[PDB]
Write a protein that binds this ligand. Sequence first.
Ligand SMILES: CC(C)(COP(=O)(O)O)[C@@H](O)C(=O)OP(=O)(O)OC[C@H]1O[C@@H](n2cnc3c(N)ncnc32)[C@H](O)[C@@H]1O
Ligand SMILES: CC(C)(COP(=O)(O)O)[C@@H](O)C(=O)OP(=O)(O)OC[C@H]1O[C@@H](n2cnc3c(N)ncnc32)[C@H](O)[C@@H]1O
Lengths: 249, 247
Amino acid sequence: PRYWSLYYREKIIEGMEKGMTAKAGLIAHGRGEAFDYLIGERTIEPAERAMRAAVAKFLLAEHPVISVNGNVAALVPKETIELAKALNAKLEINLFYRTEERVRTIAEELRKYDPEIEILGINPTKRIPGERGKVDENGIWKADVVLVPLEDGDRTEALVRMGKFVVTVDLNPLSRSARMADITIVDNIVRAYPRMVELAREMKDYSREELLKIVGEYDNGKTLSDVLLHIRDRLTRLAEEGIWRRKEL
Amino acid sequence: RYWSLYYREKIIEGMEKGMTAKAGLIAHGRGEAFDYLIGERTIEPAERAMRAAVAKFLLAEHPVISVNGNVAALVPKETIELAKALNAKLEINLFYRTEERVRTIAEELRKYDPEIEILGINPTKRIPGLEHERGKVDENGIWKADVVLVPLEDGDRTEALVRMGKFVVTVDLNPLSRSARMADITIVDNIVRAYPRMVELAREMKDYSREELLKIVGEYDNGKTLSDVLLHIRDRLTRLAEEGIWR
Ligand SMILES: CC(C)(COP(=O)(O)O)[C@@H](O)C(=O)OP(=O)(O)OC[C@H]1O[C@@H](n2cnc3c(N)ncnc32)[C@H](O)[C@@H]1O
Ligand SMILES: CC(C)(COP(=O)(O)O)[C@@H](O)C(=O)OP(=O)(O)OC[C@H]1O[C@@H](n2cnc3c(N)ncnc32)[C@H](O)[C@@H]1O
């Protein structure tokens, strides 16, 4: 139960000691944990719904890109790579609190899982019209669909104003990033990525019309509302049944 | 928001000194989120919990206030004031215990009170069910305590103390945590606000007879209080869905 929360908590700490994860990242991880408590630390129906749309969107994309930050590098290095391949997307390292050493360390971390994998962002020349804020001209710069997980709200908003269709993974359904993205997956990235990889496989042979069917029916606003409603119902349920001295929830 | 950054730095600095555990930085972030969820203030259920905690401490025969790396960075002065106001002993008790951390914590406290007695330097007693360094307490502190305050604590340790028959009070912004659920009295408020309020409550209740104190404790239901905290959060989530930008 709490085993994994402790497991990933140590992974996050390891990432900082290795030079990949920022201190702000440890703070961020903690905030995510609070919200993971609200949704019961699992994938809820509204999240699976959002992931179906996300995968469909990527499979329909012309220049898809998956972004990687210090937290992603520490939590799902292999899965982020598998997702990129499953979605035929490019991987770009893009840090909010960027330093070249963090970028190099992250790239090295990813290489350990796939020495031949192509990694963008090591030398970003273009800049998102929003000091920092540089992106690879062959990656996010040209991308039509971008996946930017555990992202700072402002950054998420910038990319959108930039004409990009933004997909994010964020446990905080009330965050600016969650509200601003086009498709918001409110689930722990450690759970969301392996589910998306599997969804991608299952949808591999879908025609364009059935992929468009899934995307067209998706409403991000309605989905975020369902997330909050799920949380409110669960809270009401817990309050009414009581949680004092309760072993597990 | 200004004070949010202020306390974040205190924690980060505490981490760089080797006083606050690294996990404490993560725990601080979890606290920030829940503080946001309840309103960044002392809600009525928290005040209700504090009144009962204070009354219970004034009834205690061997009260002890536990101190960890996060307390040391956030409320070093207020925890000493609280121990005095409640006539309780102070004991450093860490989950990620190391002698260097204990010494560093003790030193921080000494900056505010050079003569303050500090237990937990040489713990010789084991908490049943708790292994190694994470499970030893001071023979004259928590080991003999009837009422103990273990703020921002890991649930397993809170529970182990309860299993021992001790009356456990905790300050924890996460009402859903195992610690919050297992404690006898759970204060869901930020510790930077809770301690100064408990200091004030203690002075206001110092002349209370044991009957008045027992009245307060007797009317306190931690289960209903935890439920109210959850309903409060639920209601805030709702309003919050209107307050602030959207899309
Ligand atoms: C995370 C961080 C520090 C990484 O910086 P860098 O590595 O420099 O790019 C940076 O992107 C940042 O400042 O993010 P924020 O803290 O603004 O927002 C991160 C969002 O991710 C959420 N979150 C944290 N961990 C997870 C998680 N494990 N899974 C899903 N969501 C998560 C967190 O609640 C918050 O809503
Ligand atoms: C905090 C920590 C790492 C300290 O370790 P050590 O110093 O080694 O004893 C250890 O006790 C721990 O792991 O605690 P947990 O993370 O299990 O639980 C701490 C609780 O405190 C909560 N919290 C964080 N900051 C505050 C705070 N500022 N005020 C009230 N509650 C807070 C946090 O949300 C969490 O529910």
